[PDB]
Structure formats: structure tokens, C-alpha cells
Amino acid sequence: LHYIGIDTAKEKLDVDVLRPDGRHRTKKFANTTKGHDELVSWLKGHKIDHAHICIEATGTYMEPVAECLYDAGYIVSVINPALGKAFAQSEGLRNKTDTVDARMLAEFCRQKRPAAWEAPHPLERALRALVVRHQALTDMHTQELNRTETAREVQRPSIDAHLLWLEAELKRLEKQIKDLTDDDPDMKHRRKLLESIPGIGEKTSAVLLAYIGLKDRFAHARQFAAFAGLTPRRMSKAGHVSLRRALYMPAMVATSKTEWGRAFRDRLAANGKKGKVILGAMMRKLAQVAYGVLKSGVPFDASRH
Template sequence: MFFMGIDVSKAKLDCCLLLDVLSNKRRAKSVANSKTGIADLLAWCTKQQVPVHELHAILEGTGVYHEQAALVLSDASATVSIVNPAQVKDFGRSLGVRTKTDGVDSFVLARYGALLNPRAWTPPAQEARALQALLSRREAIAQDLQRERNRLEKADATDTPPLIRQSLVDSMAFLEKQLAKLQQEIDGHINKHPGLKDDRDLLTSIPAVGPQVSHHLLSVIHNHDFQSAEQLAAYLGLVPVERQSGTSVQGRPRLSKAGPARIRAVLYMAAIVGTQHNPHIKALYQRLQERGKTKMSALGAAMRKLVHLCFGVLKTRKPYHPNYAI
């Protein structure tokens, strides 16, 4: 197996092909971050006498600019791994690498793949990618609508010309129509695909899990390969991080908050509802408060419990049962 580190940017891909792990013999190439550029990269690998099916490409999961390269390489039968940038950064420090350039970063990624052999990435289904795109667009429209509402509120509180106020009203009306249309598209898309529809029905069987929570979790779970509920909670940034050492360092545990913030915001509101209407979450929340935990700490545990329940109903393929294990 030949390992290739690919440092991704918006315009280009800086690649380092590791030909020999022991001697660090390598070749470097930079191509455009486009389908044509990736085709040139595959042709270059063939010239280096590296069969595509023996190529293991390692990319960092940053933004969206790595997605096209990952999909094209995977379709070409190469093994692709998408790794955590923070872990690669720490790995580079362990090698004594202090310089940061695109070429050095690609070499560190190649060494990371050769020494740790990260798990292969499985491309998500087309319907999962489409759902993610629809939800991202809906989120963007909702944010634009809220900004316009804030501007209208300020306009009402000041001496604003009627033309500007009418412009804000018209803009809000347009965004509201777009938001309703996108929500209709999202519902129709899920109903059209049995896998998404069945999973949504299982998720919404849990008290406190409504359409927004179920749609966001559907997108996350169907676009990633989680082996356990702990992995899903860690991706969403809901695992506690402790900072204690000896007697002098006694930091308060906090959530890692490493995942998408917008999903945590939705889960936070759902957890508040769950403390009143979901028997599992309510029991956990009350137990933690009786032990002296703060309200925010107990809510963080409630969010994590909610995610575990969601993973559980999808794993067992059984709807939520309020008396299970209580």
C-alpha cells in the first residue's frame, strides 16, 4: 500500500506520495482542486508506478473543499481516510515538525497514514448528501431572515425612511417563502427515500425529538460511519473534558464543543423539553441535580443522553419505549 498525504485548500491540492516508509522517499505534486486536477493526479500516480487500487489517500476534514477529492478518489478505487486536523497537528509535533507549509503538511499526512493506518472512509449515499445540502441551505436562509428581522426592529426604533422599511419587509417576505419551500423540499426528500423516512420515524418516537432534531441527526448519522453512541456524542462535542492534575489544577469539567454548533443548539432546546417529558432524561436530570451538579452540567448530560437514545433506536430498529431500563 502506498500512502499519499493531501493538503487541501480552496484552489489546489498539495500532494505527497510516500514511496518508501523507512527511508521517507517521496514525490510531491500540486494540482488544481477540481475534477480535472484530480484526474491529472491519478495519471501522475500511474507514472510513478503506483496502482490506484493500492493508493491510500489521507485528507483532513476541513470545511467542504476536501469532499470532491475524496469522492473522486474513492470512485477511482483508491482508499481514502478523512482525519481530524487536531490529531494530525499533534502527530506532526511528535515528529518534531515545526515548519508549516503546504508541502510539509502533506508529508505529515502521508506519515500519519503510514504509521497509524487510519480507517477507510465510506462515501455517504447520494440522498444523504442531498439532505445535508438542503439543511445547510435552510440554515443559511433562516440566519438571513433573522438578520433582516433585527434590522427591521432597529428601523422601527429610529427615524428610518419608508423606502428602506418597505425593502426590509419585502426581503423578509421573500426569505419566508424560500424557507417554507426548502422545508417542503426537505420533508419531500425524506419521504421519498425509505431509509431516511424509517429512521426519521424511529427518532421522532422519542419524546423531545421533533422534526428539526431528527432532520439534523439524520444528516449527521447518514453522512458518517459511527460505530457507537459514544462516537456520535464525541462528534457532536457532547463529551465531558476534565482538567485535573494533583492538588493545584482542579478545573471544572466542560463539554468539548468540538462538533457543529448549530446541532448542539437544537439539541440543547430538545434536552430542556426532555427534562419535562422524557422519562429517561428526566430521571437523569433529577438524579444529577440531587448530587449537586449545576443546571448547565445536568443539561449537558441530558443532551448526551438524548443522543444515546437516538443512536439506540436506530441501532435496534425499535421505537422508543418509555419503560425501558427504568
């Protein structure tokens, strides 16, 4: 088994093979479809038919080659970049260059032996992309709302026109998301179970499903809550902001309007916890119950809480 490290850039790839005997092989490639073919050819050139490849999450510049090597039939791992930086410091490295990083990643692979990566389902990729687009347009719509507060009279026609455009466009995406989840019989069913939870509506169901996916990729619900950066360490905040920000207003709706939510708020209030500390706790709980309900395959039963 060889151990390969790839540093990624927009234009180039730096590759570092670490052979069983211990010697290295290094080569640069263009980060293109042609270059990716040159890479696989080069590996099979040196009779490397079994290898574990390690690569940092670097924008979306690492995604094409990761899929290419997965299809060629290698074990690919796409590591969190923060681990890589810490590992470099554990190795005592005194420089940051592309060839240094590529070699560092081969060692990371060998020593740590990280979990294998799997390309998401096309529908999961599509759903995620729409949910991310929807958040962007909501942010822009909120920016333009803030402006109406202090807008001059001459500025106001321009702002009103943009708000109309943004509202139509948000409405269009919400339909595109609905059509996506309705077509797939799995997603249609899984979304309806999420919405059974009091506090989770149309919007929050789409975001949860976009990050949970189709299959059960988490073994336990507490892992999903960790993935969202909601577990304490203060909250770690080591997880997707898009997922975490989506849960805040549902947390308020639950703690206030819903029966099971109030119960949680009251118990924590009795122990002496402040407003946002309870909301923090409820965010984590919603995440954890969301993954719970899906595993069960059964509508939200309030009796358990």
C-alpha cells in the first residue's frame, strides 16, 4: 500500500508518493481533465495499483481529481484543512510551500489512516446547492430591508424594485426545492418526517435534509449534533455555519409555541440558565432529535420527551 499526498491549487497539483520502502516520488500536474488522466497514467506507470490518497478540502478545486481517483479505484480521503495545519505543527515544520504540504499530507495519511471519502449522490449535491443559493438571496434581501430604514427618498425606488425581484426569486427557488424533494420518493418521505417535529417547517426541513443526505452516514444522533458545531467544549462552533444558523429561529419557535419545547425551556430555566443559553441547548436538541426521527422512520412522538 502506497501513501499519496496531493496539495491542490486552481491551476496545478503537487503530488507526493510515499513508497512502502520509504523513498518518495514527486511530480507536478495541471489541475484539468487532461492533467487528471496524466496523473492516473503516471501512478499506473510506476505500478501503483493500491494506494491511500490524502487531500485537503480546498474550495471546490480538489473535487474533480478526488472523483477521478475514486473512479480509478483508490482510497481517497478529503481531510479537514484544520487537522492538516495542526499536524504540520506536530511535525515541527518550519516552512509552508506546495511541495512541503504535499509531503506532509502523505505522512498524515500514513500515521493517522483517515476515513475514506465518498462522492455525494447527485440529488444531494443538487439539494445542497439550492439550499446554499436560497440562504445567499435571503441575506441579500435582509441587507436591502435594513436600508429602507434610513433610505433617502431618491434611493427608495431603487431599493423597492430590488426587493420585489429578490422576493420573486426566493419564491422560485422554494418551488425548485419542493419539486426536487417531491420527485425522489425517499426525500419526499424523509422531509415529511422532519416536518412532523414541532418547530421544524418547510425551510428548516430542506436545510436539515441537505446536510443529513439520503443514507444514514452518521452512526449516532449525537454525531450529527457535533457535525453542526452545536456541542459544548461555550459551543465548539466546529461545523457548518449554514446548518447551525438555520436552527436558531426554529429553536425560538419550539421553546415558546410548542408543548415539548416549553417543557425543555422550563426545566433549564429552573436550573438557572439565560435566554440564549437555553436557545443554544435547544438548537443542539433539534439537531439530535431530527436525526433520531429519521432513523426511527416514524413521525415525531412527543411522549419520548
